[PDB]
Every structure is written in structure tokens, then in C-alpha cells.
Amino acid sequence: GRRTR
Amino acid sequence: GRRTR
Amino acid sequence: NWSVEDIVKGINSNNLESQLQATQAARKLLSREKQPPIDNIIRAGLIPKFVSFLGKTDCSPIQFESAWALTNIASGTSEQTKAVVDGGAIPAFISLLASPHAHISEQAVWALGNIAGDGSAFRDLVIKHGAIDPLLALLAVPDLSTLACGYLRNLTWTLSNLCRNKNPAPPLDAVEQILPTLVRLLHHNDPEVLADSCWAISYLTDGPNERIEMVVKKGVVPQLVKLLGATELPIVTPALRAIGNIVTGTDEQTQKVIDAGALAVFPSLLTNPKTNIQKEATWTMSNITAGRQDQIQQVVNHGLVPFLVGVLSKADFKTQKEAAWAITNYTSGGTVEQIVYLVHCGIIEPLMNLLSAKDTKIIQVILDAISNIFQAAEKLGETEKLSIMIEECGGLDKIEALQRHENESVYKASLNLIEKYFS
């Protein structure tokens, strides 16, 4: 999924 | 971040 | 240049003109490049005096000199910024925002930007003292072009510090109050104003989807995409960071980035000479390939799959690892036809070469992508051709050798691939 980083 | 004058 | 003792003697004279000349001497000391004696000035106990001078409305020269001196102290370490705050400077500087002298008001804007930029605690303390209303009032003109250039740049930078830092993020009502002015600055044709406005937007989008929605709901995405294609690196960098933050939200928020035409800029971003630009652009791509199948199709239609193959083939390792994530997200959510097109573009060979990297997670990311591609080949009954392709690149050697990797997540994936498609 989306990888906030 | 912070700047001196 | 005076000594600290002579400055202390002049300030303790209780002669206003002697105090003015001593304060100016302190400001010139604090303005030198090589080692300003900030701690010596603090240890001399001069900060409370400087703060008192900020309220001498009848002597604007000493207001300016003391504000300038305090600004240079507040620009130093966190202990030095704290000493300025501990002297009561926050409410005094906020009162100076209403000064009829532009150079004095600008100095207060500058000082509050340094204080707020220390961290979330001082940022929220500046907000609690009520700095936002007088700051925004300085920008309440029909056309920003009538303001002085340096004055406008200082206000933009200070506003961006009020948007900065997490744990916690700035108060929602403060962000809502600032956003309309921030959108004005994001459309102002000055490179420094644009850069700092983009940084502020990148701060506000670095959070949960509710925070991202607040920014998107101001219509700034088309302007961000426009600034994404600027020639100034100090503008593209925060613009790309803001775009990358927005595509970490919902698929509808990601779709507005695509609808604004952002994917047309990525051929140059994914080949940019600046390593950090390639890394963040590939990171942005990984979060787009984690979206819907129609959004994956947008990546395909813009010709971006060959560019992902290229970044995976040759780039800095941190960029290559973002590319491996982009492929795994692509293969996880893509259709069979989209996955076949990815292999046809030559993804297999550079994918196998990175199985020799020492980073453990990138090996797990690649093995997941290889697993997803096999599942697409199972639906087509073409697992034998994929196994051959992986063999002729030397990848079977690496998949086989990864069974005595110590990490337990790797041998399971490697063994399951060896059993099901090779042995």
C-alpha cells in the first residue's frame, strides 16, 4: 500500500 | 529552519 | 567592535542614548560571521534589557537595534532561542508587528519566524500569543506586487515555519486561517516566495488524509504541477515533496494529481541529475502504482514504465529501492495485461540483479514482485517461460542462494518460489 514516508 | 541576519 | 563588558556598562547606564549606542554595538557583534559571542551576551544578562527596549515607542532606533540583536540570538541553538523566549520576547515582538516603520516590523516578522521554527512547542506558543492575525494583516493588500520584495520574502518564510513540524501538527484552525494567504503566495512570481510557499504546502500535506484534503480543497494541485516543471531546483524540490505527500492519501486525492497533468513531468524527473529528485520522483511513482488499475494504466499511457525499468537498472541504491517498491505495488494491483506489459519492457533482468544487494528489505520487496508476476503467469499458463527468463538472467542462482539468508521472511519466499516454479 501507500508508504507514507 | 532558522536564519541569522 | 566593543567588548561585552563595555556593552553591559553602556546598557546599565540608564542613559537612553548611551543604551542605544551600546545596543547597536551588541548588534554589530552579533552580526559578525566568525563566531558571534551569543552565549557571552546571554551570560551577561542582556536579553531582558533588549526585550524592554522593544517597547520604547518614542525611540524607534533602539527598537530596531534590539530587535536585530535578539533576532540573531534567536537564530542560534535551541538553548539560545529558548533564552530569547524566556526573556518575554514573544509578546513584545508581536506588538512590534504594528510598527509604522517597515524595517522594524520586518525584524519582528524575522524574529518570530526563528522562534516558531525551533519546534512545535514554540510554534504553538507563538500562535497562542496571537501572532497569526497581525502577520496576515501585513499581507492584506489587493496585489502582493506592491509590497517590498525582501519584506514579502520574510513574511512567506515566517508563515512557512508556522506550518512546519509534527508531533503535533499545527492546530487545524491556525492552518485554516493561514491557507488562503498561503495560496496567494504560491501564485506570486518571485522564486524565493514560491520556494518557501511550496515548503509550507509540503509541511501541511505531510500527515493524515484529513490534512491532505484541506490543502487539495484549495485548488493548489494545478499550481504545484506547474511549479513541478520549473527550472529552479529550490522550487522543484518542495513542489515534488508536496506532490509526493498528496499521493500518499486516498485514490481520489491521487487522481487530482494525475488530472492536473503531473505524470507528463516525470520523464525528466526520473532522469534528473540531482539524486534526491530522482529518489523522491520514484517514491512518488511507487505511491501512484499502489492505486487503482485505471491509475496504473495512466502510468502506462504516459510511457513511464520504461523509465521505471531505467531507474531500476541504474541509479543510486536508495532510488533503486524506491523503484523496487514501485514494481511491487504495480504487480500487486495491476491487471494481467499490465503485468505482461511490464515484463515486455524488460523488468526481469534488472529485478534479478538487485537480488545481490545487502539490504534485506529490498530482497523481500523483489521476491514479492517476482511472486506477483508468477501469479499473472499462472492465469495465462505461462509460468514455464517466466521460469526460463528468470533462469537465463542468473536469477535462479540468487533465488536458490537466498535460501540460507538468515532472515526468515526471505527463505520462505525463496523456497516457495523454488518449489512451485523450478523444482
Numbering used by the authors:
A (entry chain B), B (entry chain A): 212 to 216
C (entry chain C): 75 to 497
Q: What does the paper behind this entry write?
A:
Unlike surface proteins, which are highly variable between strains and mutate easily, the nucleoprotein (NP) of influenza A virus is a highly conserved protein with roles in several stages of the influenza infectious cycle. The primary function of NP is to encapsidate the viral genome, consisting of eight segments of single-stranded negative-sense RNA, into viral ribonucleoprotein complexes (vRNPs). The best-characterized NLSs, often referred to as “classical” NLSs, contain either monopartite or bipartite stretches of basic amino acids that are recognized by the adapter importin α, which binds the receptor importin β/karyopherin β1 to transport the trimeric NLS-cargo:importin α/β complex into the nucleus.
NLS2 is highly conserved between different strains of influenza A, with the noticeable difference that avian and highly pathogenic influenza A strains have an arginine at residue 214 of NP (NLS2-R) rather than a lysine (NLS2-K), as in seasonal strains. To visualize the interaction of NLS2 with importin α, we co-crystallized mouse importin α1 lacking the N-terminal importin-β-binding domain26 (ΔIBB-importin α1) with peptides spanning NLS2-K (198-KRGINDRNFWRGENGRKTR−216) and NLS2-R (198-KRGINDRNFWRGENGRRTR-216). The crystal structures of ΔIBB-importin α1:NLS2-K and α1:NLS2-R complexes were solved by molecular replacement and refined to an Rwork/free of 17.4/20.6% and 18.0/21.0%, at 2.25 and 2.10 Å resolution, respectively. We unambiguously interpreted 8 residues for NLS2-K at the major NLS-pocket and only 5 for NLS2-R, supporting the idea that a K at position 214 of NP-NLS2 results in higher affinity for importin α. Likewise, in both complexes only five residues of NLS2, the same that bound at the major site, were visible at the minor NLS-binding site (212-GRK/RTR-216), albeit the electron density was much weaker. Similarly, the refined B-factor of NLS-2R bound at the major NLS binding pocket is significantly lower than at the minor NLS pocket (76.0 Å2 vs 113.0 Å2). To decipher why an R at position 214 results in decreased association with importin α and reduced nuclear import of 5GFP as compared to NLS-K, we carried structural alignment of NLS2 with other classical NLSs solved in complex with importin α. However, in NLS-2R both P2 and P3 are occupied by arginine residues (R213 at P2 and R214 at P3 position), possibly explaining why NLS2R is even weaker than NLS2-K. Likewise, the residues surrounding P2 and P3 are not likely to make a significant energetic contribution to the interaction with importin α.
